[PDB]
Design an enzyme around this catalytic site. Structure first.
Site, PDB file in Angstrom:
ATOM      1  N   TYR B  57       0.815  -1.220   0.000  1.00 26.84           N
ATOM      2  CA  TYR B  57       0.000   0.000   0.000  1.00 26.84           C
ATOM      3  C   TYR B  57       0.844   1.264   0.000  1.00 26.84           C
ATOM      4  CZ  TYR B  57      -4.449  -2.619   0.479  1.00 26.84           C
ATOM      5  OH  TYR B  57      -5.569  -3.440   0.279  1.00 26.84           O
ATOM      6  N   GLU B 232     -14.492  -1.441  11.319  1.00 30.56           N
ATOM      7  CA  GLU B 232     -15.681  -0.748  10.899  1.00 30.56           C
ATOM      8  C   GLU B 232     -16.872  -1.163  11.739  1.00 30.56           C
ATOM      9  OE1 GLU B 232     -18.120  -1.430   6.872  1.00 30.56           O
ATOM     10  OE2 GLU B 232     -16.693   0.272   6.780  1.00 30.56           O
TER      11      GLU B 232
END
Ligand SMILES: O=c1ccn([C@@H]2O[C@H](COP(=O)(O)OP(=O)(O)O)[C@@H](O)[C@H]2O)c(=O)[nH]1
Ligand SMILES: O=c1ccn([C@@H]2O[C@H](COP(=O)(O)OP(=O)(O)O)[C@@H](O)[C@H]2O)c(=O)[nH]1
Ligand SMILES: OC[C@H]1O[C@@H](O)[C@H](O)[C@@H](O)[C@H]1O
Ligand SMILES: OC[C@H]1O[C@@H](O)[C@H](O)[C@@H](O)[C@H]1O
Ligand SMILES: [Mn+2]
Ligand SMILES: [Mn+2]
Lengths: 276, 276
Positions: B57, B232
């Protein structure tokens, strides 16, 4: 458990519910009172309500206080501060639990301009508010509560839309327009026209506001000028330069006799009492 | 001098612009950025932006940082905090004045669930944020800025509406539904479904939130369960019980490839970058 808010169905499509600086404008249909009450009870919130009843205006206290007991912050802690030149005339009204009233004895100023105007000086009496309440709400006494006025209003700083001027353009606002005055607001400036009869906030913000308006009125006096609508002129200059974190709709300051009951007002919460 | 807000003409009539607890929902057309910028500049606001770029990433950092320079808090002080296992791979991007970048070297967790999940632990590194920034904004790195993201978002605590779920009913929300999990939210509870990719607030509120979610995930682990969408899930449980003071519209977290560009989105501000 409550109705799910739906992002693609607005509550109210008929009225502006947020200002361009992202402060809520408080109308019925914008808030779930059950959520708000829980949030404020979790902090054991105390709300102070200040009211001046000088001279003949002691006659308005009974209905003011009775109606506040029915509609104002019910379920929360409330401390009424009654500023009067006549402590013996304050009616004894039976209060709900968690609610109390203090009588503060003050001088009676000769003119009504100075009675209305010296409230700012009189509210700002500083460390007693800081210790006793979390919020201060400052209202006229010649009024009655007719429907819910609750913790939806509470925020660091709020003003209330003047009921005569909410549908109007700014050039029509009766701001102070003489540059000689501390309250001066240019013709091309202005968000709203707030009424002097209902403002509030955190104790810190109210003490700032009242101190500023007091300091601004003394400067005007020393310079030989009196703002066109007195405290309300300076209130509008303050809230122009320090924008409120919530704005109350005219549901919170109305006169049914003069203005009726338009469809855009789903509730008439706090209204004027007829006077000579 | 700016357009006068008009109380009887709403900005947006197509979308909900305030939550039932009176938090603004931030859509284009709700705010005047000139007012907000002045308010935040007067406090010399500094905004910290945290981004994890672990393993592959790091490839996303160049476009992320270049695009943030174009669109994120432009005119304000900004401190980027890049959390990476590869400090040498952070691209050198030329920054505007008042903007700085720090590289924080961290461990690479073996699984992607734990990489995503340990951000909460990693953000919460406590006193350095308190001294250096006023607000913290926590985002995914696999994204790009395509339009203004500014001080309109700033508030004590905010979440962002998940772009797949904003038009949906709550029973359809992919909340954690096993009572075994700290993230558990009953079928009849819920305001919104927030995405883990963009939340923030004051440093104090972000440290609270990240600490709570971290403490909640450790309890789940010690009990042999992993919340269905990981961080989340816990983010959604936190924001259910501690409601955000602003909610960002999906303008702030979108994917044009999957969802197109519907009329209700006047701007697409911060979007997903294709990945395998
Ligand atoms: O003789 C007076 C005149 C004014 N007031 C206080 O000042 C407020 C504002 O004055 P008033 O209500 O007369 O102003 P209006 O609503 O008519 O503009 C009143 O509500 C009282 O709280 C008072 O106590 N005694
Ligand atoms: O190998 C990885 C996996 C995840 N991430 C970070 O964790 C975030 C969330 O994971 P991801 O974007 O893969 O989740 P998604 O958007 O696909 O649900 C990423 O944006 C990165 O900031 C990372 O740095 N390295
Ligand atoms: O123009 C401002 C004035 O508006 C009147 O309608 C009101 O009675 C006055 O108190 C003052 O607010
Ligand atoms: O149901 C929640 C999931 O929604 C998907 O659309 C998204 O890619 C996931 O990251 C997660 O948010
Ligand atoms: Mn009055
Ligand atoms: Mn991502």
């Amino acid at each position: 458990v409550y109705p799910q808010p739906k992002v693609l169905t607005p509550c109210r499509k008929d009225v502006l519910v947020v200002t361009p600086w992202l402060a809520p404008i408080v109308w019925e249909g914008t808030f779930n009172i059950d959520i708000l009450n829980e949030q404020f009870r979790l902090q054991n919130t105390t709300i102070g309500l200040t009211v001046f009843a000088i001279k003949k205006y002691v006659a308005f206290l009974k209905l003011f206080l009775e109606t506040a007991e029915k509609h104002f912050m019910v379920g929360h802690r409330v401390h009424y501060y009654v500023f009067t030149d006549q402590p013996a005339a304050v009616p004894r009204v039976t209060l709900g639990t968690g609610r109390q009233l203090s009588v503060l004895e003050v001088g009676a100023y000769k003119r009504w301009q100075d009675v209305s105007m010296r409230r700012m000086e009189m509210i700002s009496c500083e460390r007693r508010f800081l210790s006793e309440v979390d919020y201060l709400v400052c209202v006229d006494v010649d009024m009655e509560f007719r429907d819910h006025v609750g913790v939806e209003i509470l925020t660091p700083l709020f003003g209330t839309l003047h009921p005569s001027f909410y549908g109007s353009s700014r050039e029509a606002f009766t701001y102070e327009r003489r540059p000689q005055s501390q309250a001066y607001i240019p013709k091309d400036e202005g968000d709203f026209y707030y009424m002097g009869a209902f403002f509030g906030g955190s104790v810190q913000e109210v003490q700032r506001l009242t101190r500023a308006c007091h300091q601004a009125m003394m400067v005007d006096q020393a310079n030989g000028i009196e703002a066109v609508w007195h405290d309300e002129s300076h209130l509008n200059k303050y809230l122009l330069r320090h924008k409120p974190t919530k704005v109350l709709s005219p549901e919170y300051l109305w006169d049914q006799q003069l203005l009726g009951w338009p469809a855009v007002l789903r509730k008439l919460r706090f209204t004027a009492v007829p006077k000579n």
